[PDB]
Design an enzyme around this catalytic site. Structure first.
Site, PDB file in Angstrom:
ATOM      1  N   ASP A   7      -0.735 -11.322  -4.837  1.00  0.00           N
ATOM      2  CA  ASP A   7      -0.826 -10.198  -5.752  1.00  0.00           C
ATOM      3  C   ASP A   7      -2.213  -9.527  -5.705  1.00  0.00           C
ATOM      4  OD1 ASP A   7       0.215  -8.453  -7.734  1.00  0.00           O
ATOM      5  OD2 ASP A   7      -0.601  -9.732  -9.349  1.00  0.00           O
ATOM      6  N   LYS A  14      -2.520  -4.921  -1.064  1.00  0.00           N
ATOM      7  CA  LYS A  14      -1.216  -5.056  -0.432  1.00  0.00           C
ATOM      8  C   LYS A  14      -1.315  -5.150   1.096  1.00  0.00           C
ATOM      9  CE  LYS A  14      -0.222  -4.961  -4.638  1.00  0.00           C
ATOM     10  NZ  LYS A  14      -0.468  -6.292  -5.291  1.00  0.00           N
ATOM     11  N   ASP A  37       4.277 -10.223  -5.022  1.00  0.00           N
ATOM     12  CA  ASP A  37       4.497  -9.112  -5.938  1.00  0.00           C
ATOM     13  C   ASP A  37       4.469  -7.754  -5.232  1.00  0.00           C
ATOM     14  OD1 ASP A  37       4.916  -7.995  -8.464  1.00  0.00           O
ATOM     15  OD2 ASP A  37       2.793  -7.758  -8.956  1.00  0.00           O
ATOM     16  N   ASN A  38       5.105  -6.773  -5.830  1.00  0.00           N
ATOM     17  CA  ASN A  38       4.923  -5.384  -5.441  1.00  0.00           C
ATOM     18  C   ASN A  38       5.444  -5.064  -4.072  1.00  0.00           C
ATOM     19  OD1 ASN A  38       1.920  -5.990  -7.002  1.00  0.00           O
ATOM     20  ND2 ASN A  38       3.417  -4.583  -7.934  1.00  0.00           N
ATOM     21  N   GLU A  54       5.635  -3.502 -13.758  1.00  0.00           N
ATOM     22  CA  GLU A  54       5.131  -3.881 -15.049  1.00  0.00           C
ATOM     23  C   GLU A  54       5.031  -2.657 -15.924  1.00  0.00           C
ATOM     24  OE1 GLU A  54       3.723  -4.626 -12.023  1.00  0.00           O
ATOM     25  OE2 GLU A  54       1.534  -4.275 -12.053  1.00  0.00           O
TER      26      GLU A  54
HETATM   27  C1  LIG Z   1      -9.769  -8.591   0.402  1.00  0.00           C
HETATM   28  C2  LIG Z   1      -8.502  -9.366   0.205  1.00  0.00           C
HETATM   29  N1  LIG Z   1      -8.737 -10.600  -0.550  1.00  0.00           N
HETATM   30  C3  LIG Z   1      -8.911 -10.671  -1.895  1.00  0.00           C
HETATM   31  N2  LIG Z   1      -9.333 -11.874  -2.349  1.00  0.00           N
HETATM   32  C4  LIG Z   1      -9.560 -12.075  -3.667  1.00  0.00           C
HETATM   33  N3  LIG Z   1      -9.377 -11.138  -4.594  1.00  0.00           N
HETATM   34  C5  LIG Z   1      -8.908  -9.961  -4.146  1.00  0.00           C
HETATM   35  C6  LIG Z   1      -8.635  -9.642  -2.794  1.00  0.00           C
HETATM   36  N4  LIG Z   1      -8.177  -8.342  -2.711  1.00  0.00           N
HETATM   37  C7  LIG Z   1      -8.103  -7.890  -3.957  1.00  0.00           C
HETATM   38  N5  LIG Z   1      -8.610  -8.831  -4.879  1.00  0.00           N
HETATM   39  C8  LIG Z   1      -8.442  -8.768  -6.314  1.00  0.00           C
HETATM   40  O1  LIG Z   1      -7.057  -8.744  -6.613  1.00  0.00           O
HETATM   41  C9  LIG Z   1      -6.790  -7.701  -7.563  1.00  0.00           C
HETATM   42  C10 LIG Z   1      -6.161  -6.498  -6.879  1.00  0.00           C
HETATM   43  C11 LIG Z   1      -4.864  -6.349  -6.792  1.00  0.00           C
HETATM   44  C12 LIG Z   1      -4.209  -5.170  -6.116  1.00  0.00           C
HETATM   45  N6  LIG Z   1      -2.973  -4.866  -6.833  1.00  0.00           N
HETATM   46  C13 LIG Z   1      -2.490  -3.635  -6.817  1.00  0.00           C
HETATM   47  O2  LIG Z   1      -2.981  -2.750  -6.098  1.00  0.00           O
HETATM   48  C14 LIG Z   1      -1.298  -3.351  -7.680  1.00  0.00           C
HETATM   49  C15 LIG Z   1      -1.007  -1.990  -7.899  1.00  0.00           C
HETATM   50  C16 LIG Z   1       0.046  -1.624  -8.717  1.00  0.00           C
HETATM   51  C17 LIG Z   1       0.351  -0.191  -8.956  1.00  0.00           C
HETATM   52  C18 LIG Z   1       1.672   0.261  -9.051  1.00  0.00           C
HETATM   53  C19 LIG Z   1       1.967   1.599  -9.292  1.00  0.00           C
HETATM   54  C20 LIG Z   1       0.896   2.487  -9.391  1.00  0.00           C
HETATM   55  F1  LIG Z   1       1.190   3.794  -9.625  1.00  0.00           F
HETATM   56  C21 LIG Z   1      -0.420   2.063  -9.290  1.00  0.00           C
HETATM   57  C22 LIG Z   1      -0.679   0.744  -9.042  1.00  0.00           C
HETATM   58  C23 LIG Z   1       0.829  -2.641  -9.309  1.00  0.00           C
HETATM   59  C24 LIG Z   1       0.521  -3.987  -9.111  1.00  0.00           C
HETATM   60  O3  LIG Z   1       1.280  -4.969  -9.667  1.00  0.00           O
HETATM   61  C25 LIG Z   1      -0.539  -4.362  -8.250  1.00  0.00           C
HETATM   62  O4  LIG Z   1      -0.719  -5.680  -8.079  1.00  0.00           O
HETATM   63  C26 LIG Z   1      -8.148  -7.345  -8.191  1.00  0.00           C
HETATM   64  O5  LIG Z   1      -8.496  -8.190  -9.249  1.00  0.00           O
HETATM   65  C27 LIG Z   1      -9.050  -7.537  -6.968  1.00  0.00           C
HETATM   66  O6  LIG Z   1     -10.434  -7.653  -7.229  1.00  0.00           O
HETATM   67 CL   LIG Z   2       7.253  -5.495 -18.043  1.00  0.00          CL
HETATM   68 MG   LIG Z   3       0.972  -6.804  -8.750  1.00  0.00          MG
END
Ligand SMILES: CCNc1ncnc2c1ncn2[C@@H]1O[C@H](/C=C/CNC(=O)c2cc(-c3ccc(F)cc3)cc(O)c2O)[C@@H](O)[C@H]1O
Ligand SMILES: [Cl-]
Ligand SMILES: [Mg+2]
Ligand code: NA
Length: 213
Positions: free
Chosen positions: A139, A142, A167-168, A197
């Site tokens: 999660d 992506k 997820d997603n 969500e």
């Molecule tokens: C570099 C890859 N490794 C990583 N290792 C550890 N932490 C990581 C990493 N990447 C990202 N993170 C963290 O994970 C999280 C990021 C998650 C990205 N999730 C999304 O983009 C996401 C986006 C949506 C969404 C859906 C519809 C929309 F209109 C806009 C956004 C819905 C979701 O459920 C999502 O999970 C942050 O806390 C970030 O700092």
């Molecule tokens: Cl929900």
């Molecule tokens: Mg998600």
């Protein structure tokens, strides 16, 4: 403050310390009534709960903690002695997650790893005394689902029966991951259609069970 700080404060003021269900409810209420945030949410969360109950994993890895919603959701259902490792690269979000887990009374079941998954995954065996994972919840960004799945395999962290839950897979989507696992003999896949969500928008979870190399 930030949205994430506002969510944490809302939980602290609207849930009961040591009551994980109350913490999930508070996050979900805030994100429905006040400000949307990218937690897995209750619709997909119910599916997650059903999967966790089915498999009773002893060691779970989460990629992308954010505010700790799914870490609370999963850890509340883990059996005594089971553990969750959750990776979060953003220091501010890692602190939110730790405080969320502390409030929920789940701190003894969960370890935050404040770093990027590609740096931390190769350290799991020697530094975090991992043999193989029972379950992985993806999660995070992506476009990192596929690279990190391949890295977990390279590192010998997957065993026959390890459950990947992503997820997603619809919104925002993870097209390379999904085509790959669905096409590969190394994964047996199931799709769970649900909703984004807090939104009347179709999304879904993909379960991909590793079958060995
Ligand atoms: C570099 C890859 N490794 C990583 N290792 C550890 N932490 C990581 C990493 N990447 C990202 N993170 C963290 O994970 C999280 C990021 C998650 C990205 N999730 C999304 O983009 C996401 C986006 C949506 C969404 C859906 C519809 C929309 F209109 C806009 C956004 C819905 C979701 O459920 C999502 O999970 C942050 O806390 C970030 O700092
Ligand atoms: Cl929900
Ligand atoms: Mg998600
Ligand atoms: Na497959």
């Amino acid at each position: 403050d930030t949205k994430e700080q506002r969510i944490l404060r809302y939980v602290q003021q609207n849930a009961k310390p040591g009551d994980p269900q109350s913490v999930l409810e508070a996050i979900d209420t805030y994100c429905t009534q006040k400000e949307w945030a990218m937690n897995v949410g209750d619709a997909k969360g119910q599916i997650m709960d059903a999967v966790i109950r089915e498999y009773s994993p002893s060691l779970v890895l989460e990629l992308g903690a954010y505010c700790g919603y799914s870490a609370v959701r999963m850890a509340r259902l883990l059996q005594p002695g089971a553990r969750l490792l959750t990776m979060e690269m953003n220091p501010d979000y890692a602190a939110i997650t730790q405080q969320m887990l502390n409030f929920a009374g789940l701190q003894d079941k969960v370890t935050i790893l404040n770093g990027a998954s590609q740096d931390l995954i190769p350290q799991l065996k020697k530094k975090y005394d991992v043999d193989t994972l029972d379950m992985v919840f993806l999660d995070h960004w992506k476009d990192r689902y596929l690279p990190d799945t391949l890295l977990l395999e390279k590192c010998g962290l997957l065993r026959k029966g390890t459950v990947l839950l992503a997820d997603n897979v619809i919104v925002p989507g993870t097209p390379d991951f999904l085509a790959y696992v669905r096409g590969s003999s190394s994964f047996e896949c199931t799709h769970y259609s649900s909703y984004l969500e807090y939104m009347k928008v179709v999304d879904g979870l993909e379960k991909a069970i590793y079958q060995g190399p």
